Amino acid sequence: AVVWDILDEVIREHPVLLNRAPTLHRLGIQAFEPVLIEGKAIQLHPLVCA
Amino acid sequence: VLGLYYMTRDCVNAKGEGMVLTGPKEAERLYRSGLASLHARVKVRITEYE
Amino acid sequence: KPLVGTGMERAVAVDSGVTAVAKRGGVVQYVDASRIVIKVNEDEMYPGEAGIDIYNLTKYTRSNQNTCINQMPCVSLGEPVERGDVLADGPSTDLGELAL
Amino acid sequence: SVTEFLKPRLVDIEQVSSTHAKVTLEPLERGFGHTLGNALRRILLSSMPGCAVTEVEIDGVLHEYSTKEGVQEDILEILLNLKGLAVRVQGKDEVILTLNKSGIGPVTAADITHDGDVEIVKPQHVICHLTDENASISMRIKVQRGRGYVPASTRIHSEEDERPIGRLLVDACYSPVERIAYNVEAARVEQRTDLDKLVIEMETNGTIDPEEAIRRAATILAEQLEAFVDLR
Amino acid sequence: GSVTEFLKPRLVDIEQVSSTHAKVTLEPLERGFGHTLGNALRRILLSSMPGCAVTEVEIDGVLHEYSTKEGVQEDILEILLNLKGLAVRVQGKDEVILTLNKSGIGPVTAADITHDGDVEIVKPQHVICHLTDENASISMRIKVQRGRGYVPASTRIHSEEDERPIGRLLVDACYSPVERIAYNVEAARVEQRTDLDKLVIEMETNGTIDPEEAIRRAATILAEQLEAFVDLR
Amino acid sequence: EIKELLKLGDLPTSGQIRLYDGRTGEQFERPVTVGYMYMLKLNHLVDDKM
């Protein structure tokens, strides 16, 4: 459990970079604050996906 | 966009059409009660800033 | 079975190799989740033969895509079986019908 | 155990104003968030009782399409102002008050003929705006107690011809609640991911605080439900 | 008048269409309360009705589910899937063990399980498997426990109880006894009133739970939540 | 023929049914298309992808 607690603490304010191939233009890669979610897929905001 | 366009349209004859409301608060209250459609052509006192 | 079909599913189910098909019409003597024992009809049996056919059903083998391949019987005891009938429903097959 | 469910704690409330409140609670078992939110929203918006302005008569005014000089606003604007009028009456189920004044300026709630049993939460509220002093405003307004909300068109009928000439109808916004926005969000406790945090945005007139409204609605709902309660 | 007065609903009638299908009736109701309470009850009933399900199965002559027991028409996985739908009513115990043995040809159904005084089968005609040989016989031992919700296998094996015997098979459970709830609101004539309306609840379940008992339990938990709300300072 | 077959099943000829939102307990304002679809699993299991 302490592992998960530490993981929660470490990532509170830590941007990550999300990229999709191909990278047509400068919006192909963007930073996001991560929020930990149970599952195995990356959740995205619809506007950024469009 | 679909929902916004649906919510911005208007019908000739709708539930509670022709009423006059105070402000957007009253609009939300009236719709949530189902007493009037989204499409009613109504007079509302709106404020704005510039 | 999918609710909406096209009619060709019977053909593809028949011509696949997964489904066990009765080579000779007869009556099923015995059923088991491993094997099927068919008692062939007298007029249909090849003369001078034991007159009993045995079909062994492969159980939980490995596909080339790491998928289970299990065949299940689809009949009960003593049911008459004609020539070319479907006996063992293979993967994605239902009563001689393709069902993905 | 099976009998027990993760009851929440009143984790916080922040009053954005004397009328604006954000009540957040957590954790909640799955599906309870939306259930409680919808129940409370419907109860507050259609069942909370109260008293509000219902019918209006004016000496110089006969209909909504009529006019009265000395005031820039016409009938509809002042009717809307009257709709936006906080009021609380103790004991009496209904009472009629009189508004009368002469002079240029904002005719506010202070000029209403005061009644000891009747209280106006915001006297600073503007009812009308008289543009001249030689003219005067004189009118009578009746306030009765009711539940929830009801449009005038509901009370608009041919059977109600008993209403005399120059009697105006006003929508009865009995419910003190101005706006209620329920919201659900995820939350995790002891590695239980499917725990629901519930957030309520409440906005009410000065009749009562939002927390009192929430407790009132909860008590009403529980009391209605108490018939099937098998224990203490 | 009586602006603060609200009539209290009562279980005015209960009708039993079937052991599976039942309908209850609430009356009287204040206007608008009908839809709110109906939605609330529907959600709570679908959510949190306790029920006893099947958890563990042990079968002689086998080690894992992907094996074939001789002389059995169906294979083990199909047997487990059939066992999934079995509904067992327990009366006073959190856990119970059921031993079912059968021998000789025949369709083995739920009617054949050796019963215990505190457990019973709502649908004994629920077929399980089919023996197709006189000498072939099948003996199985099931564990039925009481729970709420829908627990997948991995969640319960996350208890990581050491040294689980190999010849033990685990099947996930869905403790919810109900299967479909719908409600309707009908204007009624009570107390010479028009505002009043009557709620009708149609509910179909596995039948292992009394309708009125379920209603009372759901009302109790909802009232607990509401009381927790009232406690706000 | 589809219309006739639906008519045999005591189902609306329009092929659209009214619905109630579960979370809201509220009826929709538009009849909705409800039918049966044959779905498949496409072997691209995320647990093998991530």
Domain boundaries, chain D: 2-49+175-232, 50-174
**Calpha distance F41→F50 (Å, rounded):** 18
- The resolution of the experimental structure, rounded to one decimal in Å, is 3.9
- Probe site for chain F from E35, E180, E181 (most F CB atoms < 10 A): E35
Burial classification of residue E110, based on how many CB atoms lie within 10 Å of its CB (0-12 exposed, 13-18 middle, 19 or more buried): buried
Two structure tokens written together for A6: 């530490």
Contacts of C2 (CB under 8 A, 6+ apart): C9, C99, C100, F38
Q: What residues pair up with E90 in beta bridges, in sequence order?
A: E119
CATH of domain D2-49+175-232: 3.30.1360.10
Q: Regarding the domain with residue range D50-174, which homologous superfamily does it belong to in the CATH classification? A: DNA-directed RNA polymerase, insert domain (2.170.120.12)
Two structure tokens written together for E1: 């008048």
Crossing angle, helix D32-47 and helix B24-32, to 10 degrees? 110
Enumerate the residues of chain E whose CB falls inside 8 A of the CB of residue D33.
none
Q: Regarding the domain with residue range E51-175, which homologous superfamily does it belong to in the CATH classification? A: DNA-directed RNA polymerase, insert domain (2.170.120.12)
Enumerate the residues of chain D whose CB falls inside 8 A of the CB of residue E46.
31
CB E198 within 8 A of CB E29: yes
Q: Does the beta-carbon distance from E75 to C70 stay under 8 Å?
A: yes
**Calpha distance D154→D160 (Å, rounded):** 11
**Calpha distance C86→C71 (Å, rounded):** 12
Q: Strands B20-21 and B43-44, how do they pair? A: parallel
Which residue type occupies D64?
Answer: E
Task: Tell whether domain C18-92 is in CATH 4.10.320.10.
Answer: no
Structure-determination technique: cryo-EM
| Residue among E182, E166, E195 nearest E45 (CA) | E182
- Probe site for chain F from C1, C4, C92 (most F CB atoms < 10 A): C4
**Calpha distance D144→E3 (Å, rounded):** 11
Residue D93 φ/ψ region, left for φ over 0, alpha for ψ in the -120 to 50 degree band, beta for the rest: alpha
Strands (E), B1-50: 20-21, 43-44
Distance between first and last Cα of chain E: 31
Using DSSP, state whether D162 is helix, strand or coil: coil
Backbone angles phi, psi at D149, to 5 degrees: -135, 150
Using DSSP, state whether D181 is helix, strand or coil: strand
Query: Which stretches within E48-144 are classed as H helix?
Result: 76-84
Q: Does the beta-carbon distance from D225 to E226 stay under 8 Å?
A: yes
H-run or E-run covering C84 = none
Q: Which chains border A (3 or more CB–CB pairs < 8 Å)?
A: D, F
**Calpha distance E90→E51 (Å, rounded):** 9
Query: Which stretches within chain E are classed as H helix?
Result: 33-47, 76-84, 153-157, 211-230
Task: Tell whether domain E3-50+176-233 is in CATH 3.30.1360.10.
Answer: yes
Q: Does the beta-carbon distance from D80 to B22 stay under 8 Å?
A: yes
**Calpha distance E84→E173 (Å, rounded):** 7
- Nearest chain F alpha carbon to E184: F25
| Residue among C86, E216, E1 nearest D144 (CA) | E1
CB C88 within 8 A of CB C55: yes
Q: How many CB pairs under 8 A join C and E?
A: 30
**Calpha distance E115→E92 (Å, rounded):** 15
| Residue among D197, D151, D202, D155 nearest D176 (CA) | D202
**Calpha distance C65→C98 (Å, rounded):** 19
| Residue among E184, E143, E151 nearest E50 (CA) | E151
The conformation of residue E185, written as its DSSP 8-state character, comes to: E
| Residue among E100, E66, E167, E142 nearest C33 (CA) | E66
Backbone angles phi, psi at A49, to 5 degrees: -65, -40
Query: Which stretches within F1-50 are classed as H helix?
Result: 2-8
Burial classification of residue D87, based on how many CB atoms lie within 10 Å of its CB (0-12 exposed, 13-18 middle, 19 or more buried): buried
Enumerate the residues of chain D whose CB falls inside 8 A of the CB of residue A1.
190-191
Using DSSP, state whether D180 is helix, strand or coil: strand
